Amino acid sequence: KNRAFLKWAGGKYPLLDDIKRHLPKGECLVEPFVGAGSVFLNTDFSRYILADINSDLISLYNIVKMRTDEYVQAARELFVPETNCAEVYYQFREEFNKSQDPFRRAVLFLYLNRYGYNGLCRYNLRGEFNVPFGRYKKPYFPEAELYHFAEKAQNAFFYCESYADSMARADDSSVVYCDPPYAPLSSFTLEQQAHLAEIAEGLVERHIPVLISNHDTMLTREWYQRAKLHVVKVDELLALYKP
DNA sequence: CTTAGACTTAG
DNA sequence: TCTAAGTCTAAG
Numbered sequence: 144k145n146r147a148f149l150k151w152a153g154g155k156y157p158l159l160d161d162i163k164r165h166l167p168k169g170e171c172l173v174e175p176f177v178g179a180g181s182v183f184l185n186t187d188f189s190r191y192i193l194a195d196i197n198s199d200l201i202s203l204y205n206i207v208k209m210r211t212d213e214y215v216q217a218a219r220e221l222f223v224p225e226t227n228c229a230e231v232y233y234q235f236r237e238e239f240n241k242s243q244d245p246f247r248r249a250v251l252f253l254y255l256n257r258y259g260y261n262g263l264c265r266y267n268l269r270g271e272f273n274v275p276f277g278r279y280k281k282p283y284f285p286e287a288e289l290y291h292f293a294e295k296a297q298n299a300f301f302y303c304e305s306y307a308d309s310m311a312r313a314d315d316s317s318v319v320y321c322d323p324p325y326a327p328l329s330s331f332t333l334e335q336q337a338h339l340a341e342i343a344e345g346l347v348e349r350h351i352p353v354l355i356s357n358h359d360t361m362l363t364r365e366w367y368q369r370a371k372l373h374v375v376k377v378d379e380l381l382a383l384y385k386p
Numbered sequence: 387c388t389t390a391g392a393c394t395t396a397g
Numbered sequence: 398t399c400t401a402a403g404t405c406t407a408a409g
């Protein structure tokens with residue numbers, strides 16, 4: 144199983160097998176919430192349409208794809224013991240927030256993801272990244288994962304946009320996999336959760352299969368009632384809209 | 387998760 | 398615009 148190079152909230156690593164078991168065959172895989180890209184990195188579609196509302200994430204992905212060798216060499220320099228301290232971290236954070244250069248920002252973004260607290264990505268209303276120092280003994284430099292990503296990215300387009308716009312990119316040859324922000328246990332509003340479900344319904348009647356994962360709650364069962372539900376116990380829910 | 391600082395609003 | 402409750406927000 145190919146691991147992602149970012150430490151990202153909600154890694155689909157433990158559930159890959161269950162996702163891949165219910166993911167229909169197609170020419171193209173569309174992911175409105177690509178995040179770290181676990182499913183992308185562990186499937187074999189001829190092409191991918193990958194999207195996310197986080198512009199730093201999408202920008203990072205475009206650069207890793209287009210300037211791999213240059214990026215890896217520059218990012219590797221930041222993963223030395225000399226950078227594993229608060230003062231250095233907070234300066235790199237300030238450099239990130241003040242940089243107007245996508246490359247340098249992409250470089251620093253990997254550093255902050257790995258050295259900051261628990262791989263969080265938080266912004267203030269001014270758009271400034273304000274995650275505190277993570278206090279790790281030895282952050283890991285995901286070189287092997289970076290190279291694998293760029294290689295696999297040659298068949299992927301990246302778009303910064305909301306789920307409604309990326310799902311509209313789907314066609315008869317497409318399969319849609321949705322990994323929305325988690326529903327509440329018994330940000331991403333309840334309206335948007337429900338709205339996502341009705342878009343899936345719209346796609347399944349245009350003969351476009353859609354797979355959605357989320358927590359297994361009373362709310363998710365209601366939003367996804369038009370779909371064939373599958374429960375994964377450890378509890379996760381897979382909602383399959385198949386023509 | 388937690389605390390601090392600040393702004394908005396009812397009374 | 399008093400005063401304090403109410404709400405929002407930033408960041409370790």
Ligand SMILES: C[S@@+](CC[C@H](N)C(=O)[O-])C[C@H]1O[C@@H](n2cnc3c(N)ncnc32)[C@H](O)[C@@H]1O
Pocket residue numbers: 151152153154175176177178179194195196197304305306307322323324325331
């Ligand atoms: C990582 S997936 C969900 C993983 C897991 N379910 C969790 O919440 O921990 C969430 C991703 O969707 C993206 N996202 C949030 N809102 C979005 C929206 N309205 N449209 C498209 N992408 C969005 C975020 O950037 C985030 O990276």
